[PDB]
Every structure is written in structure tokens, then in C-alpha cells.
Write a protein that binds this ligand. Sequence first.
Ligand SMILES: C=C(/C=C\C[C@@H](O)[C@@H](O)[C@H](O)C/C=C/C=C\[C@@H](O)C[C@@H]1O[C@H](C[C@@H](O)[C@H](O)C[C@H]2O[C@H]([C@H](O)[C@H](O)CC[C@H](O)/C=C/[C@H](C)[C@@H](O)C[C@]3(O)O[C@H](C[C@@H](O)CCCCCCC[C@@]45C[C@@H](C)C[C@@](C)(O4)[C@@H](C[C@@H](C)CCCCC[C@@H](O)[C@H](O)[C@H](O)[C@@H](O)[C@H](O)[C@H]4O[C@H](C[C@H](O)[C@H](O)/C(C)=C/[C@H](O)C[C@@H](C)[C@H](O)C(=O)N/C=C/C(=O)NCCCO)[C@H](O)[C@@H](O)[C@@H]4O)O5)[C@H](O)[C@@H](O)[C@H]3O)C[C@@H](O)[C@@H]2O)[C@@H](O)[C@H](O)[C@H]1O)CC[C@H](O)[C@@H](O)[C@H](O)[C@H](C)C[C@H]1O[C@H](/C=C\[C@@H](O)[C@H](O)C[C@@H]2C[C@@H]3C[C@H](O2)[C@@H](CC[C@H]2O[C@H](CN)C[C@H]2O)O3)[C@@H](O)[C@H](O)[C@H]1O
Ligand SMILES: CCCCCCCC/C=C\CCCCCCCC(=O)OC[C@H](COP(=O)(O)OCC[N+](C)(C)C)OC(=O)CCCCCCC/C=C\CCCCCCCC
Ligand SMILES: CCCCCCCC/C=C\CCCCCCCC(=O)OC[C@H](COP(=O)(O)OCC[N+](C)(C)C)OC(=O)CCCCCCC/C=C\CCCCCCCC
Ligand SMILES: CCCCCCCC/C=C\CCCCCCCC(=O)OC[C@H](COP(=O)(O)OCC[N+](C)(C)C)OC(=O)CCCCCCC/C=C\CCCCCCCC
Ligand SMILES: CCCCCCCC/C=C\CCCCCCCC(=O)OC[C@H](COP(=O)(O)OCC[N+](C)(C)C)OC(=O)CCCCCCC/C=C\CCCCCCCC
Ligand SMILES: CCCCCCCC/C=C\CCCCCCCC(=O)OC[C@H](COP(=O)(O)OCC[N+](C)(C)C)OC(=O)CCCCCCC/C=C\CCCCCCCC
Ligand SMILES: CCCCCCCC/C=C\CCCCCCCC(=O)OC[C@H](COP(=O)(O)OCC[N+](C)(C)C)OC(=O)CCCCCCC/C=C\CCCCCCCC
Ligand SMILES: CCCCCCCC/C=C\CCCCCCCC(=O)OC[C@H](COP(=O)(O)OCC[N+](C)(C)C)OC(=O)CCCCCCC/C=C\CCCCCCCC
Ligand SMILES: CC(C)CCC[C@@H](C)[C@H]1CC[C@H]2[C@@H]3CC=C4C[C@@H](O)CC[C@]4(C)[C@H]3CC[C@]12C
Ligand SMILES: CC(C)CCC[C@@H](C)[C@H]1CC[C@H]2[C@@H]3CC=C4C[C@@H](O)CC[C@]4(C)[C@H]3CC[C@]12C
Lengths: 244, 49, 40, 40, 294, 294, 49
Amino acid sequence: LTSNIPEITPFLVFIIGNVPLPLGTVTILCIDLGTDMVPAISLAYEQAESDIMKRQPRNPKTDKLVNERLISMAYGQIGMIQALGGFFSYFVILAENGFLPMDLIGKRVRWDDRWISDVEDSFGQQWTYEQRKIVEFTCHTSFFISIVVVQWADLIICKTRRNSIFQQGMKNKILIFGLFEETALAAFLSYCPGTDVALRMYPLKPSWWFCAFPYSLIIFLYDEMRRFIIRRSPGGWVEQETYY
Amino acid sequence: RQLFGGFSILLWIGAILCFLAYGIQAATEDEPANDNLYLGVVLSTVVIV
Amino acid sequence: EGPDNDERFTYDYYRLRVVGLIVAAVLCVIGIIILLAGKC
Amino acid sequence: EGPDNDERFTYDYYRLRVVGLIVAAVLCVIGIIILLAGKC
Amino acid sequence: GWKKFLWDSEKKEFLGRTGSSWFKIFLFYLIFYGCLAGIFIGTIQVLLLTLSDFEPKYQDRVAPPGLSHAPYAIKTEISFSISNPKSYESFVKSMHKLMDLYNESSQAGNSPFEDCSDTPADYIKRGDLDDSQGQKKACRFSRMWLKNCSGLDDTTYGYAEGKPCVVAKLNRIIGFYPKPLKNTTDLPEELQANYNQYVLPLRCAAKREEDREKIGSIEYFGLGGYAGFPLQYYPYYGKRLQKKYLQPLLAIQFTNLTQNMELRIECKVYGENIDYSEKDRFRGRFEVKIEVKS
Amino acid sequence: GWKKFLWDSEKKEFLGRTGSSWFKIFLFYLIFYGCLAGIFIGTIQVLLLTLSDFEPKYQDRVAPPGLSHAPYAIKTEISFSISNPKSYESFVKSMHKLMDLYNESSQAGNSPFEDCSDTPADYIKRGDLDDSQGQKKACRFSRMWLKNCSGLDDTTYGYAEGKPCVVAKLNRIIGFYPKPLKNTTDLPEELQANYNQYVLPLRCAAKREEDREKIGSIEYFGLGGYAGFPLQYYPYYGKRLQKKYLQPLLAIQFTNLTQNMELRIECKVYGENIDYSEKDRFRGRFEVKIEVKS
Amino acid sequence: HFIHIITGVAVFLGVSFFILSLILGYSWLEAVIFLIGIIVANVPEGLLA
Ligand SMILES: C=C(/C=C\C[C@@H](O)[C@@H](O)[C@H](O)C/C=C/C=C\[C@@H](O)C[C@@H]1O[C@H](C[C@@H](O)[C@H](O)C[C@H]2O[C@H]([C@H](O)[C@H](O)CC[C@H](O)/C=C/[C@H](C)[C@@H](O)C[C@]3(O)O[C@H](C[C@@H](O)CCCCCCC[C@@]45C[C@@H](C)C[C@@](C)(O4)[C@@H](C[C@@H](C)CCCCC[C@@H](O)[C@H](O)[C@H](O)[C@@H](O)[C@H](O)[C@H]4O[C@H](C[C@H](O)[C@H](O)/C(C)=C/[C@H](O)C[C@@H](C)[C@H](O)C(=O)N/C=C/C(=O)NCCCO)[C@H](O)[C@@H](O)[C@@H]4O)O5)[C@H](O)[C@@H](O)[C@H]3O)C[C@@H](O)[C@@H]2O)[C@@H](O)[C@H](O)[C@H]1O)CC[C@H](O)[C@@H](O)[C@H](O)[C@H](C)C[C@H]1O[C@H](/C=C\[C@@H](O)[C@H](O)C[C@@H]2C[C@@H]3C[C@H](O2)[C@@H](CC[C@H]2O[C@H](CN)C[C@H]2O)O3)[C@@H](O)[C@H](O)[C@H]1O
Ligand SMILES: CCCCCCCC/C=C\CCCCCCCC(=O)OC[C@H](COP(=O)(O)OCC[N+](C)(C)C)OC(=O)CCCCCCC/C=C\CCCCCCCC
Ligand SMILES: CCCCCCCC/C=C\CCCCCCCC(=O)OC[C@H](COP(=O)(O)OCC[N+](C)(C)C)OC(=O)CCCCCCC/C=C\CCCCCCCC
Ligand SMILES: CCCCCCCC/C=C\CCCCCCCC(=O)OC[C@H](COP(=O)(O)OCC[N+](C)(C)C)OC(=O)CCCCCCC/C=C\CCCCCCCC
Ligand SMILES: CCCCCCCC/C=C\CCCCCCCC(=O)OC[C@H](COP(=O)(O)OCC[N+](C)(C)C)OC(=O)CCCCCCC/C=C\CCCCCCCC
Ligand SMILES: CCCCCCCC/C=C\CCCCCCCC(=O)OC[C@H](COP(=O)(O)OCC[N+](C)(C)C)OC(=O)CCCCCCC/C=C\CCCCCCCC
Ligand SMILES: CCCCCCCC/C=C\CCCCCCCC(=O)OC[C@H](COP(=O)(O)OCC[N+](C)(C)C)OC(=O)CCCCCCC/C=C\CCCCCCCC
Ligand SMILES: CCCCCCCC/C=C\CCCCCCCC(=O)OC[C@H](COP(=O)(O)OCC[N+](C)(C)C)OC(=O)CCCCCCC/C=C\CCCCCCCC
Ligand SMILES: CC(C)CCC[C@@H](C)[C@H]1CC[C@H]2[C@@H]3CC=C4C[C@@H](O)CC[C@]4(C)[C@H]3CC[C@]12C
Ligand SMILES: CC(C)CCC[C@@H](C)[C@H]1CC[C@H]2[C@@H]3CC=C4C[C@@H](O)CC[C@]4(C)[C@H]3CC[C@]12C
């Protein structure tokens, strides 16, 4: 559910702010059924944190499976950071090729016209229709890769609900395999000859793969301190507000 | 029984809606995007599988 | 430079794809190693 | 636990020193490698 | 249920919490989102510092250059009746919009428009891409050069009696030097005559072998009377260093056009750093469908 | 030079800059140092969150336990004249400071001082190191137990007529269980008699073989009349979980002490989790230099 | 109960971006189609598998 937000916000800013489409449909499909699955399947192999044969039976009328405390995390805090990281890699790709963030607002109507072969950028260059479309597609590829990068820290902060990572431990071999495969698939979809004709994903330059790293580290640090106040302060605000 | 179950309903409509949009988009213009014929065959596969 | 500044408009995407594939392959292998390491 | 909780007051400084020395040695070697790599 | 979860009067709760809860949550989200906004803004400012103002860091996606045209035809088709005047209005309004930028009133004084050779010439380098010598100077391009398609004599530009014009234009690229083909034994048929090295040739033809006969006399108008672009208007230094810059233009009159029949005309520029693409039908060449139905 | 770099009146400069410069620099340093302070404070708050309030994370630097004493002798020497009263005042003031904490008035009511066995007994576990059962309860230790050194009869405690006392004390350690030596054939000579398992023995002697003769009768006072510490006062749960806790004490009277001569007396505790150190002369044992010069 | 909440948030994001789009100058046909696209995006397809 965390991956949702960074999948809808691009279109919302598209219709309201009038900017070129940040996340394509064949890329959402690649994340929705590619990257997410193996890790989500691996999250089942997680061992207990505390003694499970010691707690009382769950109340059916109060402790549900999906409460508002979860929605506040996935839809509210983690997904938001992931969406911001994606919009960062996007603006970087368009600024390095010629379209600065001030000239993108108000361009969609002429960016999508199939009969305007002269679109001026922030520096004065004239771009044909197919040329600007290639850049938009490369922005979709990097957006998808940014999603995978932030999903790394999301799969690690989702591994444990309360306990710390330095306590439980990364003894789950399936999760490790999930991260490795999740990265190999993105690189494969972006560098195999014939993807720009079949799936529309262009190769990325090596400096762009590092635009999502800080957001991931931040997600990890935020969730770590979150899981810390719950332990030291039982029954406090962080527990009745963020404890799934 | 298993095909019309769990949340296969959410996805059945998603699939139906996807092919409806491809129908309308196809008979209206000869050059429509196909984000729907794919989105629909995929969604449907996630239910059949 | 000057008139023959043709390099200013060229990029070696070929070499980039070759390297990116070598790397993807390596990551995939390492993954398999970790996965099967224990069942032998 | 209880009365015989003697472990709660022991630390294996020996093993720690052994490892810290192995590591120091390795770092020292790597350094030399980098320094002389080129003059051969 | 329905009513109580909405508003109970013993615990003074609305939707579930009290006033102090809604306040604690609203304050938390305001501080959280505020920090998020400040972080995103800082990471965008460092980005404004990385790039240069006089030159795009990457120029590989725009090469070679395209070939656009006025008028603005949708689906690359120019169809209009010689009787109904409200048929070619959408075209003239565009043609006019394009030529309205070459008005002599705009080009006046010493700056930043200097008088250049009335006959094609070689390149002109106004230094590097710096701010040292201020704003560079661009060559003047007069309207009148285009003889029968200028909107100065026959405002309509031709569409009035079955003789249309097509003003072709080369896509502006920073630091791009056009290089024409040399006089060696290998050169297309057409290009042999009038080999003005300093001129980049543009030549239109018919897509199919049949249509040849149905297409009449392609009359090109340009600088010096040649069917090309003079090399003296290059290179382009970019908006920041060359505001008030005009790119050459080439007019094409399709005289003697068969009536009531769709004609496919493909125009193409030639040169060394010019390459076409089977996917982009506007890279170096362009296609137009003309049908003067009357 | 001298005068101008200090104050010129044309550019209105002081020390070198104008008013707006000193302001730009002062404002920058204020913001910079403010951010530095906030960062250091945040990194210290996360540290306050890491650790536990009822138990030090590392307890390897304090084991085994030491052996301190009252009085407070500097260089481990107790020298005083039996005539001049202003000679043993610094000692009595300390002894008194230590015993002043065992006043019966302080130990009153059911909490948190419960009555314990008047004779040595075994350990007592008041649960785990949690806040579940509130503040734990500690055993009461009466002053009178120490018979001739209590400051209740002879305030001076002995120093008045050439017979001093030395109240020994075992260093308080959280969760430390004292373990005395067993009755097996291997045990020091001294310890054989009065083997009260529940008592940790303390025995003083002479550092050198010669001094033996010059040292008289070491009379130990303690709980039950034994020369040790009762195991019932352990373990210690820490200040937070056991405020108002009293540690056992053992009085030692050095009767029949030779006059006008420095005597080196070494006291030593025995037990399993007790180990001495050749570097720390207070770990398990202690040394005292006594010289009753009169 | 999971499907219940997921749909809750779907109609909320849609009626809200509907009033917002009308505040920006769009017509009722295009704005209606925007409410359709946002609801379809709130569908977890791998959640089923
Ligand atoms: C198939 C689909 C649908 C469409 C597909 C489409 O593409 C295609 O199929 C085409 O359709 C093909 C169809 C072809 C059909 C036929 C053709 O073959 C044939 C040819 O068509 C050609 C045309 C064609 O070329 C066309 O152009 C095609 C395009 O069509 C669309 C056009 O744009 C546009 O619609 C044109 C349509 C037409 O023009 C509309 C006309 C109007 C309706 C109407 O007015 C006309 C007219 O009047 O209608 C009359 C009939 C009447 O009875 C009707 C009664 C009216 C009711 C009135 C009540 C209104 C109402 C209603 C209330 C509920 C609310 C309320 C507020 O409003 C309330 C208020 C009241 C009080 C208002 C009362 C007003 C009264 C008005 C009425 O009376 C009438 O207007 C009136 O009578 C008039 O006559 C009269 O003139 C009036 O004029 C005035 C009235 C005003 O105008 C009007 O009122 C206005 C302005 C209202 C304004 O709103 C008011 C505002 C100002 C505002 O209030 C305001 O002030 N604000 C001020 C703010 C302010 O100051 N602020 C100050 C700030 C200070 O701080 C005047 O005022 C009035 O007084 C006056 O009376 O009451 C009558 O007939 C006539 O009168 C008629 O003329 C657009 C497209 O459809 C299409 O391209 C023709 O040229 C040709 O000749 C013909 O042959 C399915 C969609 C897909 O599913 C979806 O994928 C889709 O594709 C995407 C969404 C695309 C988008 O994205 C694309 C890129 C990628 C996408 O694809 C990706 O896929 C995105 C995805 C999506 C998701 C998410 C994600 O991303 C991905 C992930 C998903 C996956 O991941 C998941 C996991 N996570 C899993 C999986 O799901 O999936 C993009 O490329 C797309 O672009 C993009 O869109
Ligand atoms: C600027 C860039 C920002 C990037 C942000 C995203 C970061 C996300 C990726 C990686 C984060 C790594 C976090 C490191 C955590 C280490 C924790 C650790 O070490 O805790 C020690 C545990 C505890 O042990 P214990 O005391 O319970 O044992 C008891 C044994 N008894 C029972 C026998 C006594 O020990 C154990 O877990 C057992 C040993 C497990 C060793 C794990 C080593 C593998 C670690 C990471 C794999 C790399 C993934 C890379 C993904 C990229 C793909 C291209
Ligand atoms: C433990 C078990 C381990 C197993 C690991 C298995 C890993 C498998 C690794 C690699 C195999 C991948 C498939 C290989 C595809 C080869 C495609 C190829 O060689 O194409 C070459 C030609 C390109 O020629 P050109 O440059 O002249 O074209 C110019 C076109 N112009 C000029 C018009 C733009 O192709 C074309 O023309 C047409 C391109 C056809 C598109 C085929 C791509 C398939 C699409 C999606 C499937 C990917 C799903 C992901 C599966 C992940 C599994 C882990
Ligand atoms: C367990 C982990 C699974 C990981 C797998 C990732 C899941 C992927 C999920 C969704 C992606 C599927 C979307 C299908 C996209 C089809 C695109 C298509 O049909 O585009 C049509 C293009 C036409 O393009 P154009 O008009 O520019 O041509 C102009 C040619 N002129 C100008 C030269 C004439 O034709 C061409 O590309 C011709 C080449 C045809 C390429 C077909 C590639 C099909 C790829 C995947 C289908 C199988 C996936 C099953 C796995 C499910 C996993 C759960
Ligand atoms: C690119 C993405 C960047 C994202 C960065 C995000 C950084 C922002 C992180 C935190 C800012 C939010 C602080 C909000 C403070 C106001 C909240 C408030 O008003 O709270 C009131 C309560 C005190 O009420 P009570 O419980 O006594 O009343 C009992 C009432 N009853 C019964 C309901 C429980 O407050 C409490 O409990 C204390 C709880 C305070 C919350 C601690 C959360 C700390 C989380 C993260 C900080 C770590 C940042 C690491 C970043 C590294 C960057 C490299
Ligand atoms: C248990 C142990 C397991 C170990 C398994 C190890 C597996 C082997 C590992 C690595 C193999 C590396 C193969 C390297 C292939 C290099 C191919 C290459 O560099 O081709 C580049 C060129 C296309 O360049 P272009 O000019 O069109 O660029 C576009 C220019 N524009 C768009 C600007 C005009 O190729 C062409 O022309 C011709 C291309 C012909 C088709 C080659 C097929 C390569 C596809 C997939 C193989 C990679 C799989 C790696 C494993 C990944 C696992 C997830
Ligand atoms: C570009 C420049 C490259 C420079 C490379 C320099 C080479 C570095 C050389 C060696 C570093 C590895 C050290 C591994 C030593 C492990 C030994 C071990 O057994 O240690 C266990 C301790 C846990 O101690 P304890 O107190 O829990 O138990 C005490 C229990 N008693 C005392 C009772 C016994 O653990 C530890 O010391 C943890 C050891 C530290 C963990 C390594 C963290 C690595 C950090 C960043 C690297 C990330 C790379 C990501 C890849 C990106 C690729 C593109
Ligand atoms: C071109 C290629 C160049 C390659 C060169 C490679 C050089 C060789 C590399 C590594 C050699 C590793 C040697 C490991 C030695 C382990 C010794 C050890 O673990 O001893 C620990 C114990 C002392 O423990 P404790 O109980 O007193 O602890 C205190 C406990 N408390 C304080 C609480 C009471 O030892 C003892 O008793 C007995 C100690 C006897 C003396 C051992 C001498 C070791 C000193 C230096 C050798 C290390 C040099 C490494 C290279 C570094 C280069 C900068
Ligand atoms: C850790 C968090 C809370 C720090 C957030 C710092 C915020 C408040 C800082 C980070 C970067 C800063 C911006 C950096 C650059 C400029 C350009 C200048 O012409 C106006 C101020 C402006 C726009 C700054 C405003 C404040 C700013 C956004
Ligand atoms: C990037 C920089 C500028 C951020 C600096 C943030 C500063 C202002 C933040 C970081 C950690 C914060 C402290 C964290 C915990 C507490 C304890 C609480 O009982 C009082 C507030 C106090 C003392 C906070 C005051 C504000 C504080 C010091």
C-alpha cells in the first residue's frame, strides 16, 4: 500500500499543474507485478518478535487487520516521501537536457500536440515532438527505478513492526533475495536491446541512479526512531497513532 | 466459484472498464493509445491465475 | 575545437548498455548464491 | 538465571583485541598495495 | 452506530476524537509536511546551482535538426477550397503569425541586428559562450527576400488562386554548424547545379513515382535566390546570449498543382551533420499533403 | 597604520569593515552556531532514549567489588595524638557523617524498611528489575548492632583513649550476589571457625611478618556478632528501584595498639566472586596506616 | 473490511479532485472522466496474488 501514493500523484499534478506526465502506465504495471511481489511474498517468512504463545486472543470487534494507523503510515508518511523522491529524479532528467522547472508549468497542451515540431526550452533550443517524448519516457524509467530504491528501505522498515533491525536481524534469506532480484529486474528492463520498441524504457546515465538514495536513507532513519519511542514509551502517542 | 471470489470483483470490473475504454477509443479514432488493451488483459490474467 | 565539434553531440550508449547488463547479470547471480547457500 | 548470573559481568576483550588487530593489519596491507601499485 | 460515531455528547467527541486530538494530529501533520516541503526545496535549489545558464549540459537528444513548417497543418494535410474564403483562414493566421516576427520595424538600429552579406557567406563566430562581451549580435533577415510569399503584396500568400506557399524552417540548435555536401562525384542528382557551398540545400519531391507528373513547378524563394539556408546565420548562441535572433527561412510555391486530388509532397534538406529517422518523420525532412479542391 | 586600521572617518569603518559587514557576519555566526547547538541537542536526546532507567547497560568495569572505609584518611594513614583533641577531629567528623545515615528516626514505619532476621540469613529477591511492584523494600540496619563504635555512647568512637574503630563497607553493585567460600578442605586458616555460610567474612592482618607482634587484638563487630556481611542485604536493586536502602557495615576495633610506631594493617574480604588486583589496592581489600602517637 | 476502506478513500479522492478541477475551469465531461481515472488507480492487483 505504500507504493500507491507515488503512483497516483504524478497524474494529479499533471491535470492540476499542467506538466509532462511523470509516471507511465506500462511502468506502473512493471512495479505493481514485478518489483513489489517477490518482496511482499518474502515478508511471510518473518519469525516472531515476542512470544506469540503468550498474548491473549485478538478481539474481533476492535483489533482489525487494516486500521487507520496503517493508512496513516503507508498513504500518509512513507508513500509521501517516496513520491517526493520520484519527482526529484524527474526534474533532474528534464533539467539536464534543457527544460528547467520554471518553463514546465503550462506546457502539457503543447507538449502533447503531435503537430508542433518547435518547442522552445529554457535555453532557446527547438525540440521536435518525438525528441521530447523520448525524454519523457526516460523520465518514466528513472521514476520506476526511484520507486525500487525507496522500496528497499520500505521493505526493511516493514520487516519489523516494533523491534529494531539490530535486534531481530536479517536472517531471512528470502528478503535478501528479493532485494537483489528487484534490482536486477529494473536494470534488465532498462538496458536490453529492444525495450524502447516493446515497453518504451530507455537507458539511464549512471549519475541518475543516485537521485533516490537520500530519500531512502531518510525513510530508514525516520522509521527507526518511530519504532524507538514505542518501545521506551508504552501506551504513548506514537503507539496509539502509528502502531498498526 | 473461485473465479467470482475474494476481491476478484474489484478486478473483474477493472478489466471490464479497461476493455470498454478500448472499445470506445478504437471506434472513435484509428490512432488511440493502448494503455487499456494491456491494462485489461493483465488485470484479467491476475484473476484467472 | 570549432567547426568540427561533432563529439559535442555524441554519446556511447552502446558501452553503457553493455556495462549495465554485465552488472545486472552479476547482481542476479549473487542473488541466487545467497538464496541457495545453506541447502548444500 | 538468578544466583549464578556470572556472565552478566564478563566481556571477551581477548577476542575483541584479536579481531581488531587482524583488521588493523589488513588495512595496513591494503594501504601498501595502493601505494606501490604503479611502480611495477 | 450511525449517529454515535458522528457525535456523542458525553465524551464531547466528533468522528471519534475530541478537540485536543484533532489539534495534536493537525499540528503534527503541519510540522511534518512543512519539513518535507523545506527539504524538497533545498534539494531543488542545489539543482539550480549545478547547471549553467548559457548552455544545456546534454545536447545529444537534438541532433541532427528537424524541419518544421508554417502553416500549421493537422495530420500534415493542407486542404482548402478556392471559392469559400472561410476554408484557408486557419492557415493564413499561422503563416502570418510566423512572418509577423520578421517585420522591419522590429529589426532597427545597430543592435542587435547588424547588416550581413546580401549573398550567402560563411560562418560568423561572435566569440565563446560567455557573458564577457555582453549580448551578441544577429544578422538581419528581411521579409521581402521571400518574393511571392511575404504577405506584403498578397496577404493571403497564394491560397486565394490555387498557388500555395510553404515557409520551411530549420530547428534552432545551440552551437550547431551546418555542413553541406561537397562537390565530389558522389552527390544526389538535384544538388549538382548551383553548388553554393555556403548554402544548405532544401529540395522537395513526390513520395510516390506516380505523383511526379501530377506535381507542377516547385519554385523556391530564399536568400540570394537559392533554395537553401545561408551558413552566415550560424551558429546560434542561445536565447540568453542572443535575444532578438532571427533564423533563416525558405519559401516554396507549388505552382501548377492538379485540382481535386491528394498530393503527397516530401521536402528534404541535405548535409553532413544531417540524418533522417524512419521513426521521426520531421528529422531533416517533412511531409505535406496538399489538395486544392475547387 | 596604527590609528587608521582602528578607525577612519571617510569610509566609516571600524577595525576594517563597516556596520553592515559586522552585522552580516554576526548574523551568519548566530544562525550557524544555532544550528550546531540544535543538532548536538538532538543527537543527545536520542541517546537519552537508547538507555534504560533501571539498569546500566555495561557492568563489567565494577567487578569484583571494592572495599571502602570511614574514616576518610588521606594516603591511607590514621595518625592522631591522644592528648591534643584537635588532632582526630577530621576523622570523627567523617565517621559521624557515615553513621548519621543509619539513625533509627530515618528507618521508621512499614516502608520501605521491613524487619529482617536478627541473625544472618540467605538472599531475598523482591522480583525483577521493573516498575511493576513499585518501590521495593530494603532491610533495616540498626546502629546499636555495632557495639563499641556507634557514636551513641562514646561520640568520639574510641580515638579518645588509644583504641580506634574502622567501619568497613562493601561497594554497592546492582544485581550482585555475594558468594562465600565453601567448607571444603581448601579454605584459609582463619575462615575455618564460625563458618556462617550466610556471612561474607572480613579479616584484617599485618602487611609484614614483623608487625604481627606489634598489632594487638582485632575485635570485629557486626550483624549477629560475626565478622562479616549478612547475605540478606543483597542483592541491591539500584537507586531508582530502592531509594532509602542501607548497606551492611562492619566495625573493627584495633585494641592493644603499640604506641609511637607506624603499623600497616591490611583488611581483606573472602568469597567466590571476589578478586583482588595488584594495581587497585581497594578491590576487595584495603590498607590502613595507624599510628597512635601520644 | 479491507475492501471497504480502500473504496472509502477512492470516492473521497475523486469527489475532491472533482470540485478542485471545477474550480480550475474545466468542463463537466472532462472532469467526470477524471473522477473515473482516480478511482481505478486505487486498486492493489498484487495484493490478491
Ligand atoms: C474512453 C474514455 C473517455 C474518454 C476517452 C477519450 O480520450 C476518447 O475516447 C474520445 O472521447 C473519443 C470519443 C469520440 C466521440 C465522438 C467522436 O468520435 C466524433 C468526433 O468528435 C470530435 C471531438 C473530439 O475530438 C473530442 O475532442 C474528444 C475529446 O472529448 C473530450 C473533450 O475534452 C471535451 O469533453 C469535448 C466534449 C464537449 O466539448 C463537451 C461539451 C459539454 C459537455 C457541453 O457544454 C456541450 C453541450 O452544451 O451539451 C449540451 C447537452 C446538455 O443537455 C447537457 C446538460 C449539461 C448539464 C449542466 C450541469 C453541469 C453541472 C453538473 C453538476 C453535477 C455539477 C455542476 C458544477 O456542473 C453544476 C453547476 C451548474 C450550475 C452548471 C450549469 C451550466 C449549464 C451548462 C449546460 O447548460 C450546457 O453547457 C449549456 O446548455 C450549453 O449549451 C451552453 O453553451 C452553456 O455554455 C456555458 C456553460 C459552460 O461552458 C459550462 O457550464 C462550464 C465551463 C462549466 C465550468 O465547469 C465552470 C467553471 C468555469 C467553474 O465553475 C469556474 O467558473 N471556476 C471559476 C473559478 C474562479 O474564478 N476562481 C478564482 C480564484 C480566486 O482565488 C454557459 O456558461 C452556459 O450558460 C450555457 O448554457 O451543474 C448540448 O449537447 C449542447 O449545448 C452542447 O454544446 C475529452 C476527451 O473525452 C476526448 O479527447 C468532433 O470534433 C468531431 O466533429 C466528431 O465527429 C475512458 C477514459 C480512460 O479510462 C482514461 O484512461 C483516459 O484515457 C485518461 C483519463 C486520459 C488522460 O490521460 C491521458 C494520458 C495517459 C492516460 O491514458 C493514463 O491512462 C492515465 C492513467 C489513468 C489511471 C491512473 C493512472 O494514469 C493509470 C494507473 C491504473 C493502473 O495502475 C493501477 C494500480 N495502481 C492498476 C491500473 O488501474 O490509470 C491523456 O492523454 C489524456 O488527455 C487525459 O485525459
Ligand atoms: C546512502 C544509501 C542509502 C540506502 C538506504 C537503504 C538501505 C537498505 C539496504 C541495507 C540496509 C542494511 C542495514 C544493516 C543492518 C545490519 C544489522 C545486523 O548486522 O544485526 C546483527 C544481527 C543480530 O544477530 P543476533 O545477535 O540476533 O544473533 C544471535 C545468534 N545466536 C542465536 C546464535 C546467538 O545479526 C544478523 O542478523 C545475522 C547476520 C546477518 C548479516 C546481514 C548482512 C546482509 C546485510 C544487507 C544485505 C545488502 C542488501 C543490499 C540491497 C542492494 C541490492 C543491489
Ligand atoms: C533461477 C532462474 C534464473 C532465470 C533468469 C532469466 C533471466 C533472463 C535474462 C535475459 C533474457 C531476456 C529476454 C531477451 C530479449 C532479447 C531481445 C533482443 O535481443 O532484441 C534485439 C532486437 C533489437 O534489434 P534492433 O536494435 O535492430 O532494433 C531497432 C529498433 N528500432 C530501430 C526501430 C528502434 O529486438 C527487436 O527488434 C524486438 C524486441 C523484442 C522484445 C523482447 C523483449 C521481451 C519483453 C518483456 C519480457 C521481459 C519480462 C521480464 C522477465 C524477467 C525474468 C527474471
Ligand atoms: C514474476 C515476475 C514477472 C516480471 C515481468 C514484468 C511484468 C510486466 C507487466 C506488464 C507489461 C506488459 C505490457 C505489454 C506491452 C505491449 C506493448 C505493445 O504491444 O506495443 C506495440 C508495439 C508497437 O509500437 P509502435 O507503434 O511504436 O511501432 C511502430 C513501428 N513502425 C513505426 C516501425 C511501423 O509493437 C512492438 O513493440 C512489437 C514487439 C512486441 C513486444 C511484446 C512484448 C510483450 C511483453 C510482456 C508480455 C508477457 C508478460 C507476461 C508476464 C506477466 C508477469 C506476471
Ligand atoms: C525527504 C523526507 C524527509 C522526512 C524527514 C521527516 C522529519 C520530521 C520528523 C518529526 C517531526 C514531527 C514532530 C511532531 C511534534 C509535535 C507532535 C506533538 O504535539 O506531540 C505531542 C506528544 C506529547 O503528548 P503525550 O504523549 O504526553 O500525551 C498523551 C496523549 N495521548 C493519550 C493521546 C497519547 O508528543 C510526544 O509524545 C512525542 C513524540 C514526538 C514525535 C517523535 C517523532 C520523531 C520522528 C523522526 C525524527 C527523526 C528524523 C531523522 C531524519 C534524518 C535526516 C537525515
Ligand atoms: C548460476 C550462474 C548464472 C550465470 C548466468 C550468466 C549469464 C550471462 C551474464 C551476462 C551476459 C552479458 C551479455 C552482454 C550483451 C551485450 C549486448 C549489447 O551491448 O547490445 C548493445 C547493442 C544495441 O545497441 P544500440 O546501438 O541499439 O543502442 C541504441 C542507440 N540509440 C537508441 C541511441 C540509437 O546490441 C546489438 O546491436 C545486438 C544485440 C543482440 C542481442 C544480444 C542479447 C542481449 C540480451 C540479454 C542478455 C543479458 C542477460 C544478462 C543477465 C541479466 C539477468 C537479470
Ligand atoms: C570506497 C572505500 C572502500 C573502503 C573499504 C575498506 C575495507 C573495510 C574492511 C573491513 C570492514 C569489515 C569488518 C567486518 C568485521 C566483522 C567481525 C565481527 O564478527 O564483528 C562482530 C561485531 C559485533 O559486535 P558485538 O558488540 O555485537 O558483539 C561482541 C561479542 N563479543 C565481544 C562477546 C565477542 O560487528 C561489527 O564489528 C560490525 C563490523 C562493521 C560492519 C561493516 C559496515 C560497512 C559500512 C558501509 C559499507 C556499505 C557498502 C555498501 C555497498 C555499496 C556497493 C555499491
Ligand atoms: C607485504 C605484506 C605485509 C603483511 C604483514 C602481515 C602482518 C601480520 C598481520 C596480523 C597478525 C595478527 C596477530 C594477532 C595477535 C593476537 C594477539 C592477542 O590477541 O593478544 C591478546 C592477549 C592479551 O589479552 P588480555 O587478556 O591481556 O586483555 C586484557 C584484559 N583485561 C585488560 C580486561 C584484563 O595477548 C596475550 O596475552 C599475549 C600477547 C603476546 C604478544 C603478541 C604480539 C601482538 C602484537 C602486534 C602484532 C599485530 C600487528 C598487526 C599488523 C598491524 C599493522 C599496523
Ligand atoms: C531539516 C529541515 C527542517 C531544514 C529545512 C530548511 C529549509 C527551511 C531551507 C533549506 C533550503 C532553503 C532555501 C535555499 C535557497 C533559497 C533561495 C533564496 O533566494 C531564498 C531562500 C531559499 C528559498 C531558502 C529558503 C529556506 C530553505 C528551503
Ligand atoms: C537541521 C537543524 C536546524 C534541526 C535542529 C532541530 C532542533 C531545533 C530540534 C532537534 C531535536 C529537538 C529536541 C528533541 C527533544 C526535546 C525534548 C523535549 O522534552 C523538549 C524539546 C527538545 C529539547 C527538542 C527541542 C528542539 C530540538 C533541539
